[PDB]
Structure formats: structure tokens, C-alpha cells
């Protein structure tokens, strides 16, 4: 099992032992990064040959080495091992494949000829929210090397030295030193560190700003950076002028990229960066495609801000930019649904269009470890799209990331995949396995027919498995940083499962007293879920923690409200059928941070000092006046 799967693989069905005595051939001339991996894997003998084509070590294998950048030939048989790159990166990649072949001190007899289908592959740290930590970025870069991703584009929107206004200023010493270590680690792992700049919100089209931009790039070059990007995404005003962006990019190309001895990628992200944002008959994209120097890459997110790449979609862009688009794929980025983790499989992208793209990069979540699921899958897709297997690669990623609890992580991920409704209109599948038992159960229950015991048991099994998975994940110490990222969702996922269990016990409801016990327990679990949703992940945009939102929570919520109705009809009672706990009383009320709002007479659960009120455009300042009751969008802000 190899990720990414190689272009060609012949397995012979013999085992070889990794040699106890071995003779290394080419160690002094091969890529030192590759040699390093080899010597770490190891400990007159069997010949091992390592090198790039043209090296004496492997020259005789020239006809086996694919004539492709980053290509390699790998061979293991009873007499020798060959590890031969088309180029230095190819040799390194041969080693990353070799490392996966190796199991319990043993190797299969194999022959591999391999190379990437897409030239640039990797990650753009390009989101809004808390930028990745230094430690997370160091862990990312080694993960990229392992999965043959050759590109990391550094551009966190909330880094003030990447965007406005402090893009003009050189990083302070501490950050500068850390960026320098990132570049060293990137180089060692055969990843191009691409430093991007995002200057467009306040850029002036004059000599001063032009010189300041170049001076900043020069400071980055001194730190070791050899690839560069200028991003004009999500800005307004003069900085959106395509003639001027092209001129600036061409000036960078001619005065910097064609002036330093060793600059690699020069990349730009347009302002009209997906089809829906492209002004019809407006010539923004035709100006870039026509004026931009042919070596400069142009990024593109597809037909929408968030979209999967189609053949019709990529033909539409390429005809305009006159070159193959450099894909900026907006998944698993969650910076517009920050209360959701997006841990499902990578899918939706046409697997036959590798020739139509210059690069394919993924914009990930602010949760770095959790993003490795999709990242590993994108690595797989971009290297060998023709053999890309969505579900197997998802499972492979999970087993790679958390071998000691892969099935528990699979369980958690399967039910934390969808985005919920959103302004981008982008959705993913979730909980599809149990979705037929769910829909069957609910249809039968609601209308008045008997449900199938099997479906009920299926639901029971799932909640049971959810609780097992949550508790095992919380205490897993194999990848602590991943567990730190996901813990709030994990707690919420567990409460979801327990709630499911108690609602199911209500459905059976042996008797009146047992029913009420179950009902009160459920009310308490709803309160607990509210508490997590108000105290975890309290960001300004989508605060809180949602989980299992597509199929499971709605099923539990609907079953609860239905069985409560049935109890009230039967026992002539008046139990509260509401499913989301709300401390305040009044369309449902909502609490977001220090706001209390009616979904587009309120009595708060206490006296708070008020700040202001907004109603639709009406507003009034409250000036800290004590408030418990309010009586007339509809939003109250309070000091909380």
C-alpha cells in the first residue's frame, strides 16, 4: 500500500530482507536529503545504488528512470536495491516510497517507475483566523515531504507582516528567525517555501510602494526564501486594477526573479479568482492572461469561492489566462464555518485534467493537524489523479495520522464532515452509512407505524460507537496536538451520542416515571451542549462547537420532539418539546457571545448592563443601564 500510488508498480511476490551487510553506491553524490533518509532506515554486502540519472551510481539505469521532473525508478530484488531519481527531488521521492515498502525489516520484490501528474502540489496557508503555530508548521513541512508535496505557500490573512498595513515592514527578529528555520526545514524535505504578500488593500501605484514591496521580498530572500507570491484576493479599491497588478508582477519578475540566481516559483492570486466573481465581459482575466509574463502562475478557486474543479470549469479559466490555472482549492478551509470541523474525504475534483493545471494547492483549516486528513488526500490526488481513490485515501490518511486509534478517528471524522448551511452554498456528505436507518426510523415513528428493530439497533450501535470513539480520542497521547485541536468537538460529539441514547430509551419508555427520568436527563444534556457551545471556540464569526449536524443531531432532535408530543397527548401533560437549551425567554432566541437575538418581549435570565440594540436600520445606545426585560434582524448586546 503506497500513498501517493505510483504511476507504475510491478510486485513480484517474493520477500527480501533489508540487508544486514550492505554496500552503498552513490552516497557521496546523491541528493543528501535522500541519503539521510536511507541511512536512517539502515543500520561486500548487498549492493544499494542511490543517485540522480547522470550519476555514475545509477547511470546504467537511465532507460528505467522516467523522463519527468521529480520522477524516479525504484527496484528491489534478491541481488540489489536501486533508488534513482530523474533529479534530486526524484531521488528523495524514491526514498519516501521505499520507506513505505519497508515493513518488519522486510521488503517486497518490486519495480516502480513513478512521477507526479501535476507539477506543483501542496498547501496554501491562506485562511482567516489564528495562523498556524511555528510547531504546527514544522510538523506540516515534514508531512509534505513524506507525501511528495513540493509546495507550501505561506499567506495567513491575519499575519500583519503578510497583509496590510505591515506588509511593508520586515519581520521582527523572533519571527524572522522562525521563518528562517521554516525555510531550512522546507529545503530538507524538498518543499518549496513560497512566501506570499497581500499588499493590495492599501497599495499605492507609485515608486515608493513598489520599492517597498521589492525591499520586503529582498528581506525574505535573505532569510532563505526562493519562491514568491503576490495575492490580490478579497480586497477593494485601486489595488484591484488588473493592468497595474500585471505591471507589478512583471516588474518583480524582471528586476528580482530574473535577477537572483535561484528563484523558483513566482505566483499570483487574482482579485476575480473564481468564475462567479468574474465580471462578465469585463476583461479583468483577459488583461492578466494577456499582460502577465508567461512564467508567472495565476491561482484560481474554480467556479465559485468554494468549489471542486471540473473539466468545463478549468477550460473556462485557461482560455482566459492563456496558461494552465494554478488551483487554489478551498477545502478543508473552515474560516467561514468556524464552529465546524471538516474531516471528511477529499472528492469532487475531476481526475482526468492534470494536464490542464499548473499546480493544485489546498487552503486548510486553522486546525493544522486535523487538516492532515485532507492534505494527505490532496497529496495523493495531485500526484496520481488517475488512480485517486477518495475513500481508501481518507482511511489511509487516518491510519497514518493516528495509527493507535484509527477506527475511533474514522468514527469521529465520518460524523464531522458537513459544513451546515452557508453563504458559499458548499456542502459535504456526512453519516451516509446510517442515513437510511435514520430516515426509515423517523418516517415510521412520526406517521404512526412500527419501526424496524434493526434500524433502532443501528442507531443504538452508532451512539455506542460514538461514545467509545470520543473517550478514546480524548485520552490519546500519540498525536497530542491533534487531540488538543479537536477536544471541544469531541466533548460535544460525546454529549450528542449520550443524548441519542437517552432519546431512544424514551421511545421505548417502559413507564411514566422512567420516561420522565429519561426526559430530564435529556434536558440536562441539552444544557451541557449549550454550555460547550458558549464557552468553547468563542471566535467573533461563528462561535461555538457543532458536530454530527447533517443527519444525527437532527434525528435526535426530531425524535425527542415527536416522543414528547406523544407523551403529552397520552398523559395529558405539558412537557417542553424544545431541543436547544435557551436560558432567556421571549422564532427561537439565540445567544452569540454577548448578544441575544431573535432569529430573523424578551426576558433575560438575570439583570445585565446593556450596551446597545439593533433592529431592522435602527439602533440605540443603552449606556450600561441595568436590563432584564426588553419589550417592543433583532439584537440586544449586553456586558457579559
- Listed residue (584, 618, 93) closest to 379, CA to CA: 93
**Toward Ca ion, which CB reaches closer, 52 or 253?**
52
| Minimum distance, C-beta of residue 420 to ligand 5FN, in the bound complex (Å) | 15
618 binds, among Na ion, ligand 5FN, a second copy, none (CB under 5 to 8 A by kind): none
369 forms part of the interface with Ca ion (CB under 5 A): no
418 forms part of the interface with Na ion (CB under 5 A): no
DSSP letters of 72-128? EEEEE-SSEEEEEESSHHHHHHHHHHHHHH-BTTEEEEEEEEE--SSSEEEEEE--S
DSSP letters of 378-416? HHHHHH-GGG--HHHHHHHHHHHH-GGGHHHHHHHHHTS
First to last CA, the chain: 54
481 forms part of the interface with Na ion (CB under 5 A): yes
- The three cell numbers of residue 5 are 500510488
Please check whether residue 83 is in contact with residue 98, taking contact to mean a CB–CB distance below 8 angstroms: yes
Residue holding cell 518549496? 192
Please check whether residue 327 is in contact with residue 313, taking contact to mean a CB–CB distance below 8 angstroms: no
| Minimum distance, C-beta of residue 318 to Ca ion, in the bound complex (Å) | 35
Residue holding cell 493590495? 200
Residues 6+ apart with CB under 8 A from 56: 26, 29
134 forms part of the interface with a second copy (CB under 8 A): no
298 forms part of the interface with ligand 5FN (CB under 6 A): no
| Minimum distance, C-beta of residue 378 to Na ion, in the bound complex (Å) | 18
Distance in angstroms (rounded) separating the CA atoms of residues 434 and 462: 8
Q: Which of 253, 303, 335, 339 binds ligand 5FN (CB under 6 A)?
A: 335
110 binds, among a second copy, Ca ion, ligand 5FN, none (CB under 5 to 8 A by kind): none
273 binds, among ligand 5FN, Ca ion, a second copy, none (CB under 5 to 8 A by kind): ligand 5FN
Q: Which stretch binds ligand 5FN (CB under 6 A): 10-18, 74-82, 123-131, 251-259?
A: 123-131
| Minimum distance, C-beta of residue 144 to a second copy, in the bound complex (Å) | 28
Nearest residue to Na ion on Cβ basis: 481
**Toward a second copy, which CB reaches closer, 475 or 587?**
475
Would you give the binding string for Ca ion spanning residues 33-72, x where CB under 5 A is met? Answer: -------------------x--x-----------------
525 forms part of the interface with a second copy (CB under 8 A): yes
Distance in angstroms (rounded) separating the CA atoms of residues 588 and 597: 9
Would you give the binding string for Na ion spanning residues 157-196, x where CB under 5 A is met? Answer: --x-------------------------------------
- The three cell numbers of residue 88 are 534530486
333 forms part of the interface with ligand 5FN (CB under 6 A): yes
**Residue 231 CA: distances (Å) to CA of 3, 32, 197, 519, 601:** 31, 34, 6, 54, 48
Sheet holding 106-114, edge to edge: 8-17, 106-114, 72-76, 80-85, 46-52, 22-25
Coil vs helix vs strand at 611: strand
Would you give the binding string for a second copy spanning residues 379-418, x where CB under 8 A is met? Answer: ----------------------------------------
389 forms part of the interface with Ca ion (CB under 5 A): no
Coil vs helix vs strand at 558: helix
471 forms part of the interface with a second copy (CB under 8 A): yes
399 binds, among a second copy, ligand 5FN, Ca ion, none (CB under 5 to 8 A by kind): none
468 forms part of the interface with a second copy (CB under 8 A): yes
335 binds, among a second copy, ligand 5FN, Ca ion, none (CB under 5 to 8 A by kind): ligand 5FN
373 forms part of the interface with ligand 5FN (CB under 6 A): no
Q: Which residues bind ligand 5FN (CB under 6 A)?
A: 126-128, 157, 233-234, 269, 273, 301, 305, 328, 330, 333, 335-336, 363
Amino acid at each position: 500500500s503506497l500513498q501517493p500510488p505510483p504511476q507504475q508498480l510491478i510486485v513480484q511476490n517474493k520477500t527480501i530482507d533489508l540487508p544486514a551487510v550492505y554496500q552503498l553506491n552513490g552516497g557521496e553524490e546523491a541528493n543528501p536529503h535522500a541519503v539521510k533518509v536511507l541511512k536512517e532506515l539502515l543500520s561486500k554486502g548487498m549492493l544499494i545504488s542511490i543517485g540522480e540519472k547522470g550519476d555514475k551510481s545509477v547511470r546504467k539505469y537511465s532507460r528505467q528512470i522516467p523522463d519527468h521532473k521529480e520522477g524516479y525508478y525504484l527496484s528491489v530484488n534478491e541481488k540489489e536495491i536501486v533508488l534513482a531519481g530523474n533529479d534530486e527531488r526524484g531521488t528523495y521521492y524514491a526514498l519516501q516510497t521505499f520507506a513505505q515498502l519497508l515493513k518488519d525489516g522486510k521488503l517486497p520484490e518490486v519495480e516502480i517507475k513513478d512521477y507526479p501528474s501535476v507539477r506543483y502540489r501542496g498547501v496554501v496557508e491562506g485562511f482567516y483566523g489564528t495562523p498556524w503555530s511555528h510547531q504546527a508548521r514544522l510538523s506540516q513541512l515534514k508531512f509534505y515531504g513524506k507525501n511528495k508535496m513540493n509546495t507550501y505557500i505561506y499567506g495567513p490573512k491575519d499575519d500583519p507582516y503578510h497583509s496590510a498595513p505591515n506588509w511593508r515592514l520586515p519581520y521582527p527578529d523572533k519571527e524572522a528567525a522562525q521563518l528562517q528555520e521554516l525555510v531550512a526545514v522546507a529545503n530538507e524535505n524538498e518543499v518549496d517555501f513560497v512566501w506570499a504578500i497581500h499588499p493590495g488593500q492599501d497599495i499605492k501605484w507609485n515608486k515608493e510602494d513598489r520599492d517597498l514591496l521589492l525591499a520586503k521580498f529582498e528581506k525574505m530572500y535573505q532569510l532563505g526564501v526562493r519562491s514568491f507570491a503576490v495575492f490580490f484576493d478579497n480586497i477593494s479599491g485601486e489595488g484591484t486594477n488588473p493592468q497595474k497588478q500585471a505591471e507589478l508582477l512583471n516588474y518583480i519578475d524582471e528586476k528580482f526573479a530574473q535577477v537572483k540566481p535561484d528563484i523558483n516559483q513566482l505566483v499570483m492570486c487574482p482579485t476575480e479568482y473564481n468564475k462567479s466573481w468574474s465580471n462578465p465581459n469585463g476583461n479583468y482575466l483577459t488583461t492578466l492572461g494577456d499582460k502577465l509574463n508567461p512564467s508567472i502562475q495565476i491561482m484560481w478557486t474554480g467556479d465559485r469561492v468554494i468549489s471542486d474543479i471540473t473539466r468545463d470549469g478549468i477550460s473556462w479559466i485557461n482560455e482566459r489566462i492563456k496558461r494552465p490555472a494554478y488551483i487554489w482549492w478551498n477545502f478543508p478551509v473552515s474560516d467561514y464555518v468556524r464552529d465546524h470541523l471538516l474531516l471528511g474525504p477529499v472528492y469532487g475534483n475531476d481526475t482526468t485534467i492534470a494536464k490542464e493545471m499548473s499546480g493544485f494547492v489546498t487552503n486548510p483549516m486553522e486546525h493544522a493537524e486535523s487538516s492532515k486528513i485532507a492534505i494527505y488526500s490532496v497529496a495523493s490526488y495531485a500526484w496520481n489523479p488517475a488512480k485517486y481513490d477518495t475513500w481508501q485515501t481518507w482511511k489511509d490518511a487516518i491510519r497514518t495520522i493516528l495509527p493507535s486509534a484509527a477506527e475511533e478517528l474514522e468514527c469521529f471524522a465520518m460524523h464531522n464532515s458537513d459544513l451546515g448551511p452557508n453563504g458559499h452554498g458548499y456542502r459535504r456528505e456526512e453519516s451516509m452509512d446510517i442515513q437510511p436507518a435514520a430516515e426509515r426510523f423517523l418516517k415510521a415513528f412520526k406517521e404512526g407505524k412500527n419501526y424496524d428493530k434493526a434500524d433502532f439497533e443501528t442507531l443504538q450501535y452508532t451512539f455506542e460507537r460514538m461514545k467509545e470513539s470520543a473517550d478514546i480520542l480524548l485520552m490519546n497521547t500519540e498525536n497530542k496536538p491533534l487531540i488538543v485541536e479537536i477536544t471541544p468537538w469531541v466533548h460535544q460529539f460525546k454529549l450528542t451520542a449520550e443524548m441519542g441514547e437517552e432519546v431512544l430509551k424514551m421511545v421505548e419508555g417502559r413507564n411514566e416515571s422512567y420516561f420522565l427520568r429519561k426526559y430530564n436527563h435529556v434536558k440536562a444534556l441539552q444544557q451541557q451542549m449549550f454550555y460547550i457551545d458558549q464557552t468553547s471556540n468563542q471566535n467573533p464569526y461563528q462561535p461555538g462547537v457543532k458536530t454530527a449536524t447533517r443527519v444525527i443531531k437532527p434525528l435526535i432532535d426530531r425524535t425527542f420532539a415527536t416522543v414528547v408530543k406523544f407523551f403529552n397527548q397520552k398523559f395529558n401533560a405539558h412537557l417542553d418539546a424544545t431541543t436547544d437549551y435557551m436560558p432567556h425567554k421571549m422564532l427561537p432566541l439565540q445567544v452569540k457571545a454577548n448578544r441575544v437575538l431573535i432569529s430573523p418581549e424578551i426576558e433575560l435570565d438575570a439583570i445585565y448592563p446593556g450596551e446597545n440594540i439593533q433592529i431592522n436600520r435602527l439602533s440605540a445606545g443603552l449606556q450600561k443601564a441595568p436590563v432584564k426585560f426588553v419589550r417592543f434582524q433583532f439584537v440586544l448586546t449586553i456586558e457579559k
